[PDB]
Structure 1
Amino acid sequence: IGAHSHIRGLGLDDALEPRQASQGMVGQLAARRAAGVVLEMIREGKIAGRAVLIAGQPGTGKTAIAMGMAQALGPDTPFTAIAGSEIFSLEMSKTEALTQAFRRSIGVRIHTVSLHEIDVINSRTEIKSEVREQINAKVAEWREEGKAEIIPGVLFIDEVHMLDIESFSFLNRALESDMAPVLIMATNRGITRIRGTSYQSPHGIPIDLLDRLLIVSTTPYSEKDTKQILRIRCEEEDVEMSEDAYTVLTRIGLETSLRYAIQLITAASLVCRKRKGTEVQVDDIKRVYSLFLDESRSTQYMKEYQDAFLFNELK
């Protein structure tokens, strides 16, 4: 089961106004409306030489908004979401990792198949430079024939601040293509040094690329919006839960993270299943919270430990 399984589009009306709860989206109104304006630009073909940045704290639906945009663009539109750190591979070049990420977001119609799938099919049965060169000529023939349609999708780069200039320059060259997908990046970082450079820049993105961005901000969720997201996620993970439990899990979510709160659903349901239960109660959420820790509690304990042994270095 996918994390954004509930997201079926941006859920805005004809006037690009967000509906509070529609198409799997909840709240995050301003960002959803701005994402809608971007859609109109993709459709009107006014997105050339531009990209999207979704700047916001973790668990504010940056990926969910990006997913929504891909759903709203079409039911077959290729969506690829990757982390910045994912391109730093033992078995792959940063660019080859990014090339794969790009070709995953570019579709070919017959049934729709991504350029990357076509590469894997005519490979292992990193991708060969000659193989891609053949497919690029193959798809050029099919397109000019009219038997195939090139449908550019959405490429989402989470943790974008993880990229270096070498990879940032790759994206510029990549977006020069006519079949280039709509690049949407995300970060929770402000002014940071650009990796591979001695220079600092907003979100750690080179100024030349920032000057071409449509920057969107995701604001943090309220108790109401958090509950609604958990309520939706339970439905997707097929988890029945009490209202007093939702009240507690949202509190946990607000005090910790939405990720941690969602992480507890699967575990809380098992605790409940192990005793009959029928639906997850407060005691179930409470017990599962004591069992598994959030990254903040986890580090606080380790800090307390390491700091106490450092004071030992004196006595």
Structure 2
Amino acid sequence: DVTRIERIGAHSHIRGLGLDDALEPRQASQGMVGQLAARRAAGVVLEMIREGKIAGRAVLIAGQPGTGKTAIAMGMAQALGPDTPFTAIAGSEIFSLEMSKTEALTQAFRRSIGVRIKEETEIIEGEVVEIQIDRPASKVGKLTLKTTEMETIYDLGTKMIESLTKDKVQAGDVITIDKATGKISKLGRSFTRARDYDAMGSQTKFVQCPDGELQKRKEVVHTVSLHEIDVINSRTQGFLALFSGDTGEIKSEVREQINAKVAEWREEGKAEIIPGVLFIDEVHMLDIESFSFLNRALESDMAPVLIMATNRGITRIRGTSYQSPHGIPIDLLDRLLIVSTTPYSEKDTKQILRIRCEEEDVEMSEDAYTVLTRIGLETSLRYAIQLITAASLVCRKRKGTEVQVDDIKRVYSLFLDESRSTQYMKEYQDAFLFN
């Protein structure tokens, strides 16, 4: 209904890899159509990621354009969930003016490794039933909290009094006090302020009374990536650079110190490593220096699972004059497994068009489905996908309910594909610049 930040994108129909318990892909599940071998391989790679025991495993998704490489990557991301980090970058993102390409690749790798910290905290949680603060003009005070099970009266220190005054704690507030540091958080009110007070123009909903003991031993889980730790420890004001991205080349000594203390935190009970995935789409934009760094970088124990995609065949490696498969050096190709995607058939294309129509909420006739499948096979899958939306708009303009063949023919005539546009460009080539 309401227009959210996230709208219907090119992969909004992808919900996962669509596999069973035996990692045997279904024909049409979780938005996936076809690509049985590629999806089975993606499932095996996802299991390898979730086991987390093996570091620096690289998988390259290679196939023709429009065969579903980014779709498979997004399916892996969806089936991985938010708990496990999944950093997706374009290969052109590493070329930065703020840092070297190798620093960018390090930050991308370290962003794909979560550190799940655990700590125990003493938490007081209850309804303020009475608060008294007396000050000269040291401060003294008395606070009583209730939690249905008990009612305890507390004698307040000066620092707790200052915190309570700053938070403006009033009776009828459901508050939380962290005994480790005195931070005071208000969960909500339990009943209205006095009606006799003017202004105070609010009738907010009242949260239910806490239950159990007032003070509990609560375990809390905080997850940070290695890159966040690095940036925080890089300088006194490092945390500001986590958002602005003004991170220079972080000293390698700091990174070694962090790797060592993280190893200690995992030998102790303080933290757990959550190794994730770095997905470098269009990896052929990387140059020889970046591939050469990736060679050594995957040999680190803190390296994540690297997924790559490219449609280039035997092409020239950027920054060199040598041609290699996928635009990747043979030294890195040796360090990875290649997964190949196959071109779709009529049935797979029709099912993809159906799923895209369902996600775009476009009702379309079966004859329209047939003509659009023929167009997609002739021209491209993405072109037919975009004609879905254009034909929906043209049908709604005419006050129609179902996209018919006339709408598809209309939008086909209105919007050209690469081939017809190229033919018309050649027919008028003298009008274009530099022939």
What band does the TM-score fall into relative to the shorter chain? Answer: 0.7 to 0.9
Percent identity over the alignment is: 100
Give distance in 2, aligned partners of 1:263 and 1:30.
27
Q: Is the 8 Å Cα contact of residues 19 and 40 (structure 2) preserved in structure 1?
A: yes
Return the match for 2:85 from 70, 78, 82.
Answer: 78
- Per-residue CA distance 1:88-134 (angstroms, 9 max, x = gap): 4567654455445434433344375655677899999x999999899
Residue equivalent to 2:67: 60
> Using a 3 Å threshold, how does the CA distance of structure 1 residues 65 and 203 change in structure 2: closer, same or farther?
same
> Using a 3 Å threshold, how does the CA distance of structure 1 residues 285 and 122 change in structure 2: closer, same or farther?
farther
Unaligned runs of 5+ in 2: 1-7, 117-220, 236-248
- Per-residue CA distance 1:51-85 (angstroms, 9 max, x = gap): 11111111111112222233334453333333333
Return the match for 2:99 from 92, 97, 104.
Answer: 92
Give distance in 1, aligned partners of 2:375 and 2:229.
45
> Which deviates further from its counterpart, 107-116 or 235-244?
107-116
- Count of residues paired in the alignment: 311
> Which deviates further from its counterpart, 63-72 or 160-169?
63-72
Give distance in 1, aligned partners of 2:300 and 2:387.
43
- Per-residue CA distance 1:228-268 (angstroms, 9 max, x = gap): 11211222222222222222222222112212222222322
Pair 1:123-2:267 in alignment: no
Q: Is the 8 Å Cα contact of residues 70 and 77 (structure 1) preserved in structure 2?
A: no
Unaligned runs of 5+ in 1: none
Return the match for 1:166 from 264, 289, 294.
Answer: 289
Q: TM-score of the superposition, structure 2-length normalised?
A: 0.61
**Deviation of the 1:38 alpha carbon:** 2.8
**Deviation of the 1:226 alpha carbon:** 0.9
Q: Is the 8 Å Cα contact of residues 20 and 29 (structure 1) preserved in structure 2?
A: yes
> Using a 3 Å threshold, how does the CA distance of structure 1 residues 138 and 291 change in structure 2: closer, same or farther?
farther
**Deviation of the 1:217 alpha carbon:** 0.8
**Deviation of the 1:160 alpha carbon:** 1.9
Give distance in 1, aligned partners of 2:432 and 2:391.
35
> Using a 3 Å threshold, how does the CA distance of structure 1 residues 263 and 145 change in structure 2: closer, same or farther?
farther
- Per-residue CA distance 1:184-236 (angstroms, 9 max, x = gap): 11122221121122221111111111112111110001111111112112222
Q: Is the 8 Å Cα contact of residues 65 and 311 (structure 2) preserved in structure 1?
A: yes
> Which deviates further from its counterpart, 132-141 or 81-90?
132-141
Q: Is the 8 Å Cα contact of residues 49 and 212 (structure 1) preserved in structure 2?
A: no
Q: Highest relative contact order (Cα 8 Å, sep 6+), 1 or 2? A: 2
Give distance in 2, aligned partners of 1:91 and 1:250.
47
Return the match for 1:211 from 315, 334, 349.
Answer: 334
SS of equivalent residue, structure 1 residue 113 = strand
Q: TM-score of the superposition, structure 1-length normalised?
A: 0.81
**Deviation of the 1:299 alpha carbon:** 2.8
> Using a 3 Å threshold, how does the CA distance of structure 1 residues 238 and 112 change in structure 2: closer, same or farther?
farther
> Using a 3 Å threshold, how does the CA distance of structure 1 residues 23 and 179 change in structure 2: closer, same or farther?
farther
> Using a 3 Å threshold, how does the CA distance of structure 1 residues 310 and 99 change in structure 2: closer, same or farther?
closer
Give distance in 1, aligned partners of 2:100 and 2:426.
36
Query: Which structure would you say has the larger Rg?
Result: 2
> Which deviates further from its counterpart, 105-114 or 63-72?
105-114
> Using a 3 Å threshold, how does the CA distance of structure 1 residues 232 and 99 change in structure 2: closer, same or farther?
farther
Q: Specify which structure has the higher proportion of helix.
A: 1
> Using a 3 Å threshold, how does the CA distance of structure 1 residues 151 and 81 change in structure 2: closer, same or farther?
same
Give distance in 2, aligned partners of 1:3 and 1:49.
29
Q: Is the 8 Å Cα contact of residues 70 and 153 (structure 1) preserved in structure 2?
A: no
- Per-residue CA distance 1:242-299 (angstroms, 9 max, x = gap): 2222222222221122122222223222222222212222222221222222233323
Q: Is the 8 Å Cα contact of residues 272 and 279 (structure 1) preserved in structure 2?
A: yes
Q: Specify which structure has the higher proportion of strand.
A: 2
> Which deviates further from its counterpart, 46-55 or 145-154?
145-154
